[PDB]
From a paper:
In this study, we present the cryo-EM structure of the ETBR–Gi complex, complemented by MD simulations and functional studies. These investigations reveal an unusual movement of TM7 to the intracellular side during ETBR activation and the essential roles of the diverse NPxxL motif in stabilizing the active conformation of ETBR and organizing the assembly of the binding pocket for the α5 helix of Gi protein.
First, the structure of the ET-1-bound ETBR–wild-type Gi1–scFv16 complex was analyzed by single particle cryo-EM at a global resolution of 4.6 Å. To improve resolution, the structure of the complex, including the dominant negative Gαi1 subunit (DNGαi1), was determined with a global resolution of 3.2 Å. Receptor density was assessed in the ETBR–DNGi1 complex after adjusting the alignment center to the receptor. The Gi1-bound ETBR structure displayed a typical outward movement of the cytoplasmic side of TM6 to a moderate extent (approximately 7 Å), similar to other class-A Gi-bound GPCRs. A significant interface between ETBR and Gαi1 was formed by TM3, TM5, TM6, TM7, ICL1, and ICL2 of the receptor, in addition to the last 15 residues of the C-terminal α5 helix (residues 340–351) and the following three-residue wavy hook (352-GLF-354) of Gαi. At this interface, the backbone carbonyl of G353H5.24 (superscripts refer to the CGN numbering system)29 and C-terminal carboxylate of F354H5.26 formed hydrogen bonds with the side chain of S3908.47 and the backbone carbonyl of V3897.56 of ETBR. Notably, the large side chains of L348H5.20 and L353H5.25 nestled deeply into the hydrophobic pocket formed by V2033.54, M2965.61, M3005.65, V3216.33, V3256.37, and V3897.56 in TM3, TM5, TM6, and TM7 of ETBR. The hydrophobic residues I344H5.16 and I343H5.15 formed interactions with W206ICL2 and I209ICL2, respectively.
Author numbering:
A (entry chain R): 88 to 301, 312 to 399
B (entry chain A): 4 to 55, 182 to 233, 241 to 354
C (entry chain B): 3 to 340
D (entry chain D): 2 to 120, 124 to 235
E (entry chain C): 9 to 61
F (entry chain L): 1 to 21
The structure:
Amino acid sequence: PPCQGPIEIKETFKYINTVVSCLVFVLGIIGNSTLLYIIYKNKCMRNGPNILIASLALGDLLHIVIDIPINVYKLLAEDWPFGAEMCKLVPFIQKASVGITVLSLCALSIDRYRAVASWSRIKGIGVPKWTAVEIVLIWVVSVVLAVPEAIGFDIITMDYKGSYLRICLLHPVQKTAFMQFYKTAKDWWLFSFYFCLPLAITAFFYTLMTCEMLNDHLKQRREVAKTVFCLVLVFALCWLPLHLSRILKLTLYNQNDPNRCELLSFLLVLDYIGINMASLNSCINPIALYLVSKRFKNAFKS
Amino acid sequence: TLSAEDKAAVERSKMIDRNLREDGEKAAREVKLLLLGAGESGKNTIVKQMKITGIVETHFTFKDLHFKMFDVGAQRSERKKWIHCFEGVTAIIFCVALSDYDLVNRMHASMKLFDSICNNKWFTDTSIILFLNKKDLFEEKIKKSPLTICYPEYAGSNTYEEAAAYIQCQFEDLNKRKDTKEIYTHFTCSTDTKNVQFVFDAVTDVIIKNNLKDCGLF
Amino acid sequence: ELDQLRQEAEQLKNQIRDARKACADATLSQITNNIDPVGRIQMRTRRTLRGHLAKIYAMHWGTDSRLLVSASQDGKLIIWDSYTTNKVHAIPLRSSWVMTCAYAPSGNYVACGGLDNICSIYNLKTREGNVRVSRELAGHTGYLSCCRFLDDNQIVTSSGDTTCALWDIETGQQTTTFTGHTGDVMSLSLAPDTRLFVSGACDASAKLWDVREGMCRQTFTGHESDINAICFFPNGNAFATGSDDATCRLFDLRADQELMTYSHDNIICGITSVSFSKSGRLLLAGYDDFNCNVWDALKADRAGVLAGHDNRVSCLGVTDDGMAVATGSWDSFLKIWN
Amino acid sequence: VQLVESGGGLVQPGGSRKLSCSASGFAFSSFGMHWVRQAPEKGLEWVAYISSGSGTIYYADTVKGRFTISRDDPKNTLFLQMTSLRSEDTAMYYCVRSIYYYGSSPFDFWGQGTTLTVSSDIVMTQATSSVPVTPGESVSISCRSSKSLLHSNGNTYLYWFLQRPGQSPQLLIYRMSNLASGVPDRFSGSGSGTAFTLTISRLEAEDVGVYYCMQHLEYPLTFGAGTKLEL
Amino acid sequence: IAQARKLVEQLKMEANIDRIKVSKAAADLMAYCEAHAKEDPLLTPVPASENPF
Amino acid sequence: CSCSSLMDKECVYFCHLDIIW
């Protein structure tokens, strides 16, 4: 059924979102750039977490560079003048960047828990034994689980009653039956693997870290205990709106509800805010390292 | 390319490299302690608890970590030319005797040596583990002697607990940093392995703190 | 009566000083400006030798100019093949506290000394195929600075005993003992003719001795702090010292004086190891600010910088061939700079 | 040092037997090990090789699969077990130690040998096989190759062995120029690719035997037919 | 008292040395440096034909 | 973004204005 059709993005919404997204983009790229520069200087403290922070920062830079520019252009032209192959590839790399980011966060969580629970290999500065396995496993699982998006998106120009569309949508009809099965409930699997699993594993590992961890000794036991928990809280808080928006647009979308036009418009507004917060979560990790360790504090202050 | 003998020579070097890393990982799972202190300041008695011509390396084990102690203050040599050899040590065990506070300026010499090595460039982050030896005789001699003799600008009651507390805080204030370098205090409780438990706990603490610093979480 | 001897001593010191000044009529700076400088020197890293997992404190080349032995604080000294970066041997030490590792000019033996006051001699070419200790030269009473070989049977060591001794491998006792230094001797260099050697101590004084006779012929002064490194000029008539003032002064054996100081205001750290080149035009230096310097031994102007190390360079040596320079720093890496 | 092997005896064709060599007096784990077959009348032939730590095994193409070797470093023993023997395997087997680094001398020591009776390679050719000599006379022995033994690194991998009548051959010169330890200085060697020579100066007694030229550029290690000296 | 006697004896022994002019030593140092300069692989860089590394 | 059919002019317009995700 046809609604009135007030499906549009507010002019003031574009005004605030463009500058906010650009500022988050600038802060994200510079923070990850100097993190990679500092990591390449940290050869006296070369360890597993040293590699993992670089991997998270590099994937973080990739995510921001490939997400912010295109999305902020969706507020000005909203027509996608890009190519068919680029339209078929950008979602794949974006999902790959998200995959490596969350897995690196998980990899950080296990390493920063084994530091206090496994004080048997007490020292040794270099490259660890099986971290090379984990980093490769992270980078291969990401693409293996992102290739459904690689072959899904495709431009098709429908004739709207007043314009000629250029949607880069997941096509309802495709060749492979597995793709139809995937896109049937893609949002649920996206929610579980990217939000719920990295939220549960990192929280559990840090909870184990605090339990094993718990004068100045006990105060610093609690200081790191609140630090990791606040870090996980930041991750969950900032990554929620994207997955919530996809869930709402999936099952709460009706077929004969007059409120659908308003619902979709606010769903778009929520989704734009969600991508802003996801980029904010991306930039969070350099801030967390700076506001905790004095080593990185003076490294940035140099 | 490489010939037959060159190929076998490379295989020999790789076999050597494997054995080097094998011994390297074994030595990594081992804690080194730079023991030192004043003359007859409990070092002769500490080694008898932590054992069962330039370096007297004392080797013993505990629950784990295979502690290694290099007694360097007993031999008579220069001050700070081999001190760069001991950089990177896990901890430094300083043994200061409380029975030398009346013998003549020994307490001053111990304190100045503590100040010199606590602020040293090499040992900026390495923790120092204190050991106040001869506690019982210290109580007896402060019963037979006043307390203001050692420190002219300090006044207080002539009781064991306040004297132990005041000397402990005086020693700990001699450092210029507190966040990175840590000082652990004890009193050599009796002659049992309780001292060994204390140093094991202190070494466990500093390993955890440095491990977190490597992870960027501390 | 003792003051009379003190008065005689200062009178002789004064008379030596003015005789030294009288023989001084010019400086090396006022003449080297006539000859053109080389310019800029680029030292590109060729080989990085990654076998040690602890800071290395000394290394030495072989006269073959291909093998070099390096000793670190992890308890093992490794024999390296420079051209292919191969571990020819790995010798476990009986005490990880090691300060030096020499190489016999014939290549048959490698010596090693440290905080145990013993320079133990290892035998490389053996029937059984395993490196075994040949001798242990105890009897020094002080930590060892460096051992140097004359032949396969004679070795000169300088220890913290404030003395230098000439040992004998086959017997085991020091035939000749050199004394006269006040502080501990921290460096030793052998002249190319192998007849005289120069030792550097904490007295801020460098003196050379008659190896055949056994007593010092003359003693040089002028340094302000302890001399951490001394290397002979290839011609054998000069040596360049190294102190903690970042000054690599240069002295004359025949003129019995000092030619020119090598002072740069940008460097206020300490010197760890100095050396020359095969021709002797440029002298290298190992500073405490994590990088190696390449001076000009005649013009006294920095002709380059070698800064591939992320820690202080504890030792550096030049092959007698003259091709490469091996710098080993506390990051457990030997780096070859052609 | 000494290498002593055992386990050799008459077998029927198609049978199996295992040869064991016991090593003593040196670091057995640091040395590679070679098996060489000396035919009842012919010259030396190579069989198999095991590196240090058993990380590399090579075989002659004539005994591939049929033979197999193993070592047990903790008990200092080398094994050569052979299955389905042919009639041409009747020979005397030596165990030879060889350690490879810069400046080493492989094939330095040879085992005594154990008898046995059953009822594309770089060809090394010696033009002569028997030259009469007298004491006090200088004699040159030349042995050619089917390919140049000079390598790109400068090493010319050519070896010379002297098998005195009655015992195992010993290394004289390694890499065609370097005299082995314990040999008199009167020997000499030089040459180039596909052209090698060994000049002996002031020949004396105890120098009479068969001289074998062995190439070590690549496996299998083909020996020469051997030149025999007579008085 | 004996130590001063030893030190002054060593100083007087070092006093009787036939030293040479400093300009002479500087000239010899210059002469040796330039004579062997052409065969210095560090002073004058070597092409990648005599380079082993 | 994902729709059920290519005829409902509401979801496809929504996919037009949505983000790349």
